Amino acid sequence: XXXXXXXXXXXXXXXXXXXXXXXXXXXXXXXXXXXXXXXXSQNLEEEKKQRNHFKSIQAKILEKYGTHKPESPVLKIVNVTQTSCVLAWDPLKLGSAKLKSLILYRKGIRSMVIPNPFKVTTTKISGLSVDTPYEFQLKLITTSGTLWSEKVILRTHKMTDMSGITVCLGPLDPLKEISDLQISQCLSHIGARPLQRHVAIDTTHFVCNDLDNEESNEELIRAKHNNIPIVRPEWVRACEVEKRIVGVRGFYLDADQSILKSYTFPPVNEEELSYS
């Protein structure tokens, strides 16, 4: 209720003439004898409003620090060539989120949308330019929101830098007398990544001497599917001797063999062999 009273002396009077007492010393000094004051002076709706705020905040806190929160994606550099790079991320973590969208960015979204961000943790970025800096970043669309972070910047290698060549080795013809050991030593000299026996996303070149038995060679079929150059071992040697990565067409398994005479492997070096 809200009811207006008038004041004679600490005695207060209704317009009904019913007279309510109040304290002489505790009487509000904004008031003089024969004032009109309106008592009510209290509010029981405000409590409901306050209770509502308390819970909204509690609810927010709980969601925010109480639920399982999808973590931000971590972007790493797998390998870098002159025209290319391979990128991967640490596996996705979403506590309760459905994941909707995973997307790559370099100076904006022109970069694509990863088809299977779960099953497959990598992508190869193909067309590029020699000795030119780039930057890439990931963006995550999950039900619980979009998070992203940690963009990286990498400078593609120059012609003379061979560190990014990663060879997967296939069948060698015993008669041709070139050994895996020779190829590896050569790879070591040029500072290339160690020699794979298996074809991955990051394989640059498949080295091979022996076609026969080629069919049913899973690595060769993968190499073809990945569109990786299939080259004779002498290609690696030539890279080492010309101190830069060189053309591969001259070393295709059907290429004219006159050029191979000029890139024969030296005999295995035991010091290097013994050392490692």
Partner: protein, 673 residues
């Protein structure tokens, strides 16, 4: 001569025998000491004259004294003449010494000083102002102190004369209003009261009628109104003098305006003027109320005053049948004073007139809810007992002081310890003074509302109906507050009846104090008693029974029935109680009656003559009420006709005509102005 009358009175005073020499003045001082220590002195004690005598044979000094009001005391002159007349007029034994000391005492309640005028054996006089709070302290008399004393004695004399309940037996009341030039006497008195208006809140008040003293409720304002009642030709003069005071003394305007307003109240000729002065008085007040945040003591004084004026308006509107306006002020008034009885009372009246009886009953529920000196007097009780408290030495001494009196005649005039001798016989008539007055004695004090306590015990026992006594006892007497309420209940009963009133009570429970429950039952029993008929039953009924029946009938508003019973009670003997009620109903007829004639002027003149005679016997030579009656009669019949009608009455001799001629002379003097 006006001197003639005064001379006769001064020689006609009673004598009270002091028990122990000195007791009289020692008790006076004690009583004053108490009054002062307690919160309200009020009016203080009535004036006293004390006589000191020496019995020569024994070495013993003895005293005598009496009470008196109405001696002037504008200074020592008048009291001294009085003492001189007393001493010169003595008739004493050889055994009584001629050395005699006389003292006159008049209490000044403005300064709280007792002024004592002492007339020595050597015939010299000294005045002392006694402060009774600090025993030893005596001061000297300034002019201001004399004026205060003059004013004290005049206020006290008016208030006392007009309330019989305050009068002791044998009190001598002088006609303070008489003088050489009648008009100048009255003016002197009026101006004295008006100049003292600012100090009115120091004058005491009757707490029967009001919670606190207010500018409107206090003895000074009451005495001024009572006096103006008998001097209507002086109204215009008075309003002017106040208009003049407010100009010389603007800081007191509230007091002077209030006096204008209360003086013109209930004078139909002057209503336009009253309404106009109220208007000018009230509006400023709402402002001045809201312009104090202190709530200083002046705030309650003003709020009370504001509410008292509003009450006057409310009453006026109600009497004129305008209930809508009445209710408007009535609201405002009850807010400003929640402590105001009058405010709730009018608020109830408003509801009653608008026929909303529950609100009325609510209002009623909401409302807010002395001297011992009579050892000396014994009532004769219609000759059924002896009244003599004197010892033989006391009587020997008394007789010595009154040589001119035959001793057996003297003994017959003594009532207890007081000698009710009246020597000059002013006011005498045979039927009154030689019969009824001797029986009964003076009728005054709290018992004076009926004759129950004055009459033969046998006569009371003889009353068939117990309720008849029970509803009239001094205990179950109503009193101003409950009387006013009883009235509102009567108003309600008249419309819907007692059964109706009672339903209203329980409707109100839905939306009750015990004191109210008690009134309902009283009202019920009074209504029942009202129905009774004491005639035609071949049953003999005493005067007392007729008188009690009549009082009940007045109470229940059966006017004709009441007049009839009251007159019947006067048939076998004079009944001062019934007589006064009859004169009162002639002077102030009930409002509800439609200009009906309850009593014819011949009947009135007869009663008025007897009453004046009764009053004079016991020393009331002032008689303000009786003058009001004479004034009304002169208005109706004319002064000369009225005088002839008085002369035509068989009881009228010369002694009573002295008194009547004086009163008529005074009234006549007032007509030229």
């Amino acid at each position: 001569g006006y001197q003639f009358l005064n001379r006769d009175i001064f020689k006609s005073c009673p004598r009270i025998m002091e028990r122990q020499f000195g007791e009289c003045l020692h008790n006076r001082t004690h009583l004053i000491k108490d009054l002062i220590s307690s919160g309200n002195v009020g009016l203080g004690p009535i004036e006293i004259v004390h006589m000191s005598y020496l019995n020569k044979h024994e070495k013993e000094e003895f005293g005598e004294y009496f009470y008196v009001t109405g001696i002037e005391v504008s200074g020592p002159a008048m009291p001294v003449e009085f003492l001189e007349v007393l001493k010169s007029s003595k008739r004493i034994s050889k055994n009584i010494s001629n050395n005699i000391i006389l003292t006159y005492c008049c209490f000044n309640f403005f300064s709280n000083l007792d002024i004592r005028i002492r007339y020595d054996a050597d015939d010299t006089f000294q005045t002392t102002a006694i402060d009774c709070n600090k025993e030893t302290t005596d001061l000297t008399m300034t002019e201001k102190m004399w004026e205060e004393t003059f004013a004290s004695s005049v206020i006290r004399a008016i208030i006392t004369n007009t309330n019989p309940e305050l009068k002791p037996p044998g009190l001598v009341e002088c006609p303070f209003y008489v003088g050489k030039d009648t008009i100048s006497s009255c003016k002197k008195i009026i101006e004295l009261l008006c100049r003292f208006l600012p100090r009115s809140l120091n004058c005491g008040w009757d707490s029967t009628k009001s919670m606190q003293a207010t500018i409107v409720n206090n003895y000074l304002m009451y005495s001024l109104k009572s006096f103006i009642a008998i001097t209507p030709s002086l109204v215009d003069f008075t309003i002017d003098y106040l208009k003049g005071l407010t100009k010389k003394d603007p800081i007191h305007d509230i007091y002077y305006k209030t006096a204008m307003i209360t003086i013109l109240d209930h004078i139909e000729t002057k209503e336009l003027d009253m309404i106009t002065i109220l208007n000018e008085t009230l509006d400023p007040l709402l402002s001045l109320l809201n312009d104090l945040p202190p709530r200083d003591a002046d705030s309650a004084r003003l709020m009370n005053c504001m509410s008292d004026l509003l009450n006057i308006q409310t009453n006026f509107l109600l009497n004129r049948g305008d209930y809508e306006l009445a209710l408007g002020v009535s609201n405002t008034s009850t807010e400003l004073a929640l402590d105001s009885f009058e405010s709730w009372y009018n608020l109830a009246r408003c509801h009653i007139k608008k026929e909303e009886y529950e609100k009325a009953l609510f209002a009623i529920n909401s409302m807010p809810r002395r001297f011992l000196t009579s050892n000396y007097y014994k009532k004769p009780l219609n000759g059924t007992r002896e009244h003599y408290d004197l010892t033989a030495m006391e009587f020997t001494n008394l007789s010595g002081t009154l040589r001119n009196w035959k001793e057996d005649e003297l003994k017959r005039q003594i009532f207890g310890r007081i000698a009710m001798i009246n020597e000059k016989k002013i006011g005498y008539t045979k039927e009154i003074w030689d019969d009824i007055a001797i029986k009964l004695g003076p009728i005054c004090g709290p018992q004076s509302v009926n004759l129950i306590n004055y009459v033969s015990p046998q006569e009371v026992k003889n009353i068939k109906n117990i309720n008849l006594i029970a509803r009239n006892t001094i205990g179950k007497q109503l009193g101003w507050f409950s009387g006013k309420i009883y009235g509102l209940l009567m108003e309600i009963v008249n419309k819907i009846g007692w059964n109706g009133l009672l339903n209203i009570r329980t409707e109100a429970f839905m939306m009750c104090e015990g004191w109210l429950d008690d009134l309902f039952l009283d009202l019920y029993q009074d209504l029942k008693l009202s129905k009774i008929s004491l005639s035609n039953k071949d049953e003999k009924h005493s005067g007392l029974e007729w008188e009690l029946l009549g009082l009940i009938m007045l109470r229940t508003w059966h006017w004709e029935d009441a007049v009839a019973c009251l007159r019947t009670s006067i048939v076998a003997r004079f009944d001062p109680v019934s007589c006064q009620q009859l004169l009162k109903i002639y002077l102030q007829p009930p409002k509800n009656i439609q200009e009906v004639t309850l009593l014819d002027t011949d009947t009135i003149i007869s009663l008025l003559i007897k009453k004046i005679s009764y009053d004079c016997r016991y020393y009331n030579y002032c008689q303000i009420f009786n003058l009001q009656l004479l004034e009304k009669l002169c208005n109706e019949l004319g002064t000369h006709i009225l005088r002839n009608k008085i002369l035509l009455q068989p009881s009228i001799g010369d002694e009573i005509m002295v008194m009547i001629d004086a009163m008529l002379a005074w009234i006549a003097d007032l007509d030229h102005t």
